[PDB]
Design a binder for this molecule. Sequence first.
Ligand SMILES: Cc1ncc(COP(=O)(O)O)c(CN)c1O
Ligand SMILES: Cc1ncc(COP(=O)(O)O)c(CN)c1O
Ligand code: NA
Ligand code: NA
Lengths: 452, 450
Amino acid sequence: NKPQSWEARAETYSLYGFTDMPSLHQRGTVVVTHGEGPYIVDVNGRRYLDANSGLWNMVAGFDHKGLIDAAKAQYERFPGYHAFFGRMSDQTVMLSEKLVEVSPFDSGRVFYTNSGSEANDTMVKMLWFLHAAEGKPQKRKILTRWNAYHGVTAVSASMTGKPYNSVFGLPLPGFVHLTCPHYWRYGEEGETEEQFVARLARELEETIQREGADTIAGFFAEPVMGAGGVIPPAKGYFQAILPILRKYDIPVISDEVICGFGRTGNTWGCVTYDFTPDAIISSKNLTAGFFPMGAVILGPELSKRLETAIEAIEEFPHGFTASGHPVGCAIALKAIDVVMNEGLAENVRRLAPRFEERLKHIAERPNIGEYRGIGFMWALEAVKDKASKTPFDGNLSVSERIANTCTDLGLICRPLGQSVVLCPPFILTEAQMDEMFDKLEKALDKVFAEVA
Amino acid sequence: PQSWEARAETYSLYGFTDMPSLHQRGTVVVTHGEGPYIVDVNGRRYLDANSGLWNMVAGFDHKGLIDAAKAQYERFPGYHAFFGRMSDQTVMLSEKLVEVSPFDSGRVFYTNSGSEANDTMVKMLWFLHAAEGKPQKRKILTRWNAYHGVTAVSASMTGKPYNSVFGLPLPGFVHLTCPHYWRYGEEGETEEQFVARLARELEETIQREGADTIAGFFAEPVMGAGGVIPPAKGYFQAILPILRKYDIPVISDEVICGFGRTGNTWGCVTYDFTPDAIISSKNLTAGFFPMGAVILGPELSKRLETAIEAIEEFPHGFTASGHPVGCAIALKAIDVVMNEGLAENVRRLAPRFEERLKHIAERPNIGEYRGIGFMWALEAVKDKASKTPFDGNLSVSERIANTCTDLGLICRPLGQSVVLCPPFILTEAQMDEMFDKLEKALDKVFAEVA
Ligand SMILES: Cc1ncc(COP(=O)(O)O)c(CN)c1O
Ligand SMILES: Cc1ncc(COP(=O)(O)O)c(CN)c1O
Ligand code: NA
Ligand code: NA
């Protein structure tokens, strides 16, 4: 009784992650064979415009010749190794030199992982290691914000501020979730944006005082929240919170997994939001989705502190088998070159005004509560009533319905809560952006005429 | 910085690297390899008797594997496996993994690493027991000297003293006695009594903790980073009925043992035990791509599917999970290991490997040799009769390994031991080269230390 179709084979042997099971049973797995520019093609030859770059990461599209050629060239040269025991590939040394150079840091050090989850988990371990070595083993608590997404390891899931993590009995103790700086959602009745930011700063200060600064290991933040539904922080947020963190000796980590390498219109989300973190977490665009790589980029202050702590014990007992893989490092060197030097990062800056202008027009509809975003990261929030910010009942699945209608029109859209997220590849043309918008509008025109 | 060595030190934060040796010797920057050899920036060639990190079983320039990697980049260079979408390569590999696993049926979940795969398996157990009305069933049983990875959870599962630097283990991670008879057997305790004690100890721990509070048990069939530790005779035959008696899922961590190293496709087959799930990585891609897999047997597959259908979505996964390049590479690595004579070369050469180690173990400073297939270790001692090791300050194993490097051999120092886990492509002449160089390093270091 062996399965025959691609659909039956997928269901017989897979355990699906982040997959809505009722939709999967109704529709069948969409099995993908190849891509062309920003388009993905399934086993039935159907072509979809992937307006999510796969998972934010495939910024150069699905068949970029330069990246394909750089990947092939490294397999022909040296197809694998590790970075332990005082050995490392030439590609690993070149990537660390490049990452420190492209980072906003004047100097620093890089530690490799395969994923963003491992890199966040690693940063947490580095902070525990460092503070205990400096005479404060109780300095262990990690501050993140509700709606944040930092990954799925037990630690990186505890840092994530998502209700679904209750199914794992998470967060673990020592993981503190601050108010999310989403003004439209979290601003109170009659609270101005300036008051809202001031309240976030008083809340952080009160939290640090109650918990005790000596028990707090670090603060992580995505400059613009990704999986939280594309959330640029309220005006002046980083300028209000960062002095408080610095006052209390709380290391500041920018989680640049999504924001690194151009999506917010700058190389780093921390540059767009004008703040200097002590370390950066990078992945995704780092390899343009061509290879699993994550990196922890430590600034000068933490680099110096960690090295003294490591010199004292003689060895830093942490690392992944594939950390610093020569193939991933060669691919990352090419992805960085493609994004920064081949006009991809510029294309986001050039097309962001037109992107915003079309979303502003779409937001005039009564069922759109707001549009939000920056550069090539945007969201449209669905509402039953605009003035009162009333959502549609959770059972109506408005965003999933918009997204399913988009799939049927040949557009890949991401439903998140009551929102629809767009994060297309940086290679997107004006015509393809018009294509993306026309199909989304037809899906909005259908779902809103139906539910409301 | 100008030199490769200075550039490496200026920009790297080194993991699992002895900093005094690094400052003394400089970073060894590798540019390429040939068969089982690695070549540095100075053109020096070393026989890598550790397959890089156990994983590069087909060597450093395998044409079939390089061609398979290139062909997938040309076809489809990347994608994910979320939201009901997945590459054709991901479906193919799941089908193949279930087939080659000892399970008649099952399901596969992907990760990038062995650490993520273990951390994932722990979350899966927390998820499952809570869904089945036992949210307190959270504790994880591992052994002292086990190595399961470096995420906070997989480091908590690892039984290494160095984890104290991170304030780890986290609560709820219980380390049972290591079934290494030579080290943990008491004075006057037979191997049979030793195994009976570890069974009694497991039962006592389950009874003290409460079976309803224990999520699962994980075991490497042969311990790897622990220093190549085959378990004491009849260990799994004594512990498994206890775990099954108390409803404690059994997970075989096959990250090193999967695909051939013990002389079988899985370490759990070599040790004649059926786990409920398998953790696979390393040989899975022959070190050509970061991939890990959780292979769920039929019982856990059914219970997890029921729990997932009840909440409608399993909210877990990594951006690169099921990457089509990793999947096309893993399909080729499995083909090379199982069909191109590599797994067979391990069985064919394991007797010669052991015969040579038995001769080396005659030396007064070798406490024991241990291992199986293509996984072995030699334990250095000051005194054989009393099992007295050399003082930690003498760094005997590091000295053996640094001497090996100076002779063009890469071998791994672990504790007071030296580990050999060479590629499956190793010829008899290359095995002779590995042992001749090792014996010269043993002669040099032992003559200096005593
Ligand atoms: C901001 C952010 N941080 C961390 C991660 C975790 O990265 P990975 O899926 O590679 O583990 C993600 C993944 N969506 C992310 O968006
Ligand atoms: C048995 C075992 N399990 C898990 C792991 C973790 O694998 P990774 O380094 O890919 O995280 C290792 C890695 N040495 C291992 O040997
Ligand atoms: Na810089
Ligand atoms: Na099978």
